Amino acid sequence: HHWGYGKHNGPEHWHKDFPIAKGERQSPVDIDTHTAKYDPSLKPLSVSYDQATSLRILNNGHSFQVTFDDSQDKAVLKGGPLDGTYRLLQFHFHWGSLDGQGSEHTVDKKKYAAELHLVHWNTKYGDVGKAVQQPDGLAVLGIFLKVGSAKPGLQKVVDVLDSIKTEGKSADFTNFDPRGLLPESLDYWTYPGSLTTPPLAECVTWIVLKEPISVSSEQVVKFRKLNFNGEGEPEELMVDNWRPAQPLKNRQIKASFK
Numbered sequence: 001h002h003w004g005y006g007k008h009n010g011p012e013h014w015h016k017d018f019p020i021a022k023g024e025r026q027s028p029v030d031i032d033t034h035t036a037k038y039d040p041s042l043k044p045l046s047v048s049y050d051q052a053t054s055l056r057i058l059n060n061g062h063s064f065q066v067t068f069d070d071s072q073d074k075a076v077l078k079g080g081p082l083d084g085t086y087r088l089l090q091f092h093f094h095w096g097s098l099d100g101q102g103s104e105h106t107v108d109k110k111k112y113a114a115e116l117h118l119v120h121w122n123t124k125y126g127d128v129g130k131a132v133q134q135p136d137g138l139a140v141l142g143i144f145l146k147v148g149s150a151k152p153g154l155q156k157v158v159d160v161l162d163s164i165k166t167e168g169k170s171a172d173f174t175n176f177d178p179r180g181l182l183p184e185s186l187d188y189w190t191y192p193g194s195l196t197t198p199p200l201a202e203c204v205t206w207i208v209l210k211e212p213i214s215v216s217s218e219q220v221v222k223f224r225k226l227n228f229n230g231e232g233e234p235e236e237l238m239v240d241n242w243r244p245a246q247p248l249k250n251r252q253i254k255a256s257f258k
């Protein structure tokens with residue numbers, strides 16, 4: 001069993017290969033808005049994506065991702081709850097089979113149709129492999145998707161998905177500007193957590209934006225036409241590629257806003 005999202009290899013099985021799945025700082029979590037504490041010491045988030053260089057778009061059999069040149073400080077996250085500078089490596093999404101599920105984080109138990117993760121690593125560790133071994137190695141910016149109006153800045157992504165249908169396919173994907181995926185407000189919740197896929201390392205400062213973006217039904221339908229399987233294997237729609245909320249345990253979720 002390679003891990004996945006199915007009955008026999010999904011999230012409830014992951015602890016067998018990755019025992020940290022039952023750890024003290026696992027992600028995602030439910031964000032209980034009434035118990036999150038406003039922290040006036042939290043700084044505004046600094047998102048500097050003007051010089052981003054996208055490279056490729058890839059179906060990895062679990063999601064699709066857009067990868068960036070992370071060999072220089074071109075697209076960086078700073079400020080917020082963070083110390084130092086975090087380079088953008090990639091973004092990807094989690095989504096559902098229907099609009100009432102798909103997000104990893106939840107808000108007062110509400111599930112969104114999808115969740116966008118912009119993955120960044122701390123430059124003090126030099127490379128992402130080293131960063132995942134550190135408790136402050138990664139910063140993932142999470143953005144909820146609800147279904148309504150289209151997000152124009154997402155359309156270039158969805159229009160190429162037919163070229164990466166099955167696991168193992170990739171395409172050139174240059175000049176994509178991730179600023180077109182961001183909501184108006186950068187108000188956020190933050191807490192210490194983990195990767196939400198294997199190896200589930202406890203290396204992430206999570207930053208989850210309060211404001212969702214809206215995407216159209218046609219845009220999310222194109223996500224749902226992707227396949228978990230490789231070409232030639234039985235077709236299994238890439239849907240419900242989300243890990244459920246995990247126990248908060250001894251953690252405090254902090255809000256940047258009142």
Ligand SMILES: NS(=O)(=O)C(F)(F)C(F)(F)C(F)(F)C(F)(F)F
Pocket residue numbers: 117119138140194195196197198199
């Ligand atoms: N969902 S998530 O924690 O962003 C993640 F996909 F697991 C991930 F962090 F991006 C990751 F895949 F583990 C990696 F960091 F390797 F990119």
Ligand SMILES: [Zn+2]
Pocket residue numbers: 092093094117196
């Ligand atoms: Zn993710």
